Amino acid sequence: LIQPSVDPRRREEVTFYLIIRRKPLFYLVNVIAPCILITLLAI
Amino acid sequence: VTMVVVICVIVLNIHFRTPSTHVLSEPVKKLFLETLPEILH
């Protein structure tokens, strides 16, 4: 529950937060591993 | 495919070895020209 600042002379709200982690397996298969292989071939 | 490219690089290194660059070792020459040609074929 967020209450606003005191007025010398924004409204109060209820905020629901979602901290969410991405699961990167797709990008590990489609981008990272081909890049690693290309880097070995560049070696 | 990456491993096959590495294999091709190694095979081309083996193919273009020259007397003035590398020494043909007798164990290597006897292994890769007598034993393995008979084993494979």
| Buried b or exposed e, range A5-40, using 16+ CB within 10 angstroms | eeeeeeeeeeeeeeeeeeeeeeeeeeeeeeeeeeee
Query: Angle CA(A3)–CA(A7)–CA(A8) in degrees, nearest 5?
Result: 155
- Asked if the C-beta of B3 comes within 8 angstroms of chain A's C-beta atoms, the answer is no
Distance CA B19, CA B30 (A): 17
User: Angle, to 10 degrees, between the axis of helix B2-15 and the axis of helix A33-42?
Assistant: 10
Q: How many Cβ atoms sit within 10 Å of the Cβ of residue B25?
A: 9
What six digits make up the tokens of A12?
């109060």
Q: Rounded to an integer, what distance in angstroms lies between the CA atom of residue A36 and that of residue A24?
A: 16
Q: Which amino acid is at A34?
A: P
Decide if B9 contacts A43 (C-beta within 8 A).
no
| Interchain pair B6, A37: CB under 8 A | no
Contacts of B2 in chain A (CB under 8 A): 37, 40-41
- A20 touching B (Cβ < 8 Å): no
